[PDB]
Amino acid sequence: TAKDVTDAIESQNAQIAVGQLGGTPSVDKQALNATINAQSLLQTPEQFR
Amino acid sequence: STGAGSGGQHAVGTGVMGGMISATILAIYFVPLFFVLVRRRFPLK
Amino acid sequence: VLLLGGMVFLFLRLPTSFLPLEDRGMFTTSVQLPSGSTQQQTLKVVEQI
Numbered sequence: 690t691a692k693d694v695t696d697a698i699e700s701q702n703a704q705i706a707v708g709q710l711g712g713t714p715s716v717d718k719q720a721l722n723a724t725i726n727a728q729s730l731l732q733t734p735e736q737f738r
Numbered sequence: 739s740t741g742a743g744s745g746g747q748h749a750v751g752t753g754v755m756g757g758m759i760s761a762t763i764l765a766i767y768f769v770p771l772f773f774v775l776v777r778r779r780f781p782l783k
Numbered sequence: 784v785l786l787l788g789g790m791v792f793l794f795l796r797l798p799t800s801f802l803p804l805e806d807r808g809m810f811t812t813s814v815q816l817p818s819g820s821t822q823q824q825t826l827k828v829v830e831q832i
Contacts, residue, residue, distance in 0.1 A: 713822055721819045745803035764786075 702731045 705727035711719040731737055739747040812832065816825050 711821055715821060715823070717823070719821045719823065722821050723819055743805050745805040749803050 698737070701728075702737070704729050 707725035707727050709722060709724055711722040715722075739751075814825060814828055814832065816828060
């Protein structure tokens with residue numbers, strides 16, 4: 690149905706902010722603190738297909 | 739002045755005092771010369 | 784005329800500023816560890832300072 694297509698487009702085309710590696714509070718000797726990102730928006734029409 | 743905020747006081751005062759010192763040992767001499775020169779160039783009436 | 788020329792000369796040698804700095808009794812230091820550092824390392828550096 691059209692709802693299935695809309696839901697798939699919503700789920701598979703999004704920007705997700707996961708968080709941070711070594712965020713506060715952290716273990717006693719955490720090595721680094723890096724931002725974590727996830728899947729980003731689709732760009733080309735081929736990606737949507 | 740030797741207190742808090744003395745920097746601004748020095749900035750406003752040193753230049754003013756130095757200007758007034760020169761404008762009272764040079765004006766008393768040059769001003770008459772300027773006046774006589776201008777008046778002779780453009781006589782009154 | 785010589786005085787006028789000297790006044791011109793002095794005006795072009797005098798350095799320029801906006802407002803003099805004055806002792807306010809406070810000052811601030813900034814600590815910046817290399818990117819990706821963790822809070823504990825920054826705390827150690829701050830303890831040293």
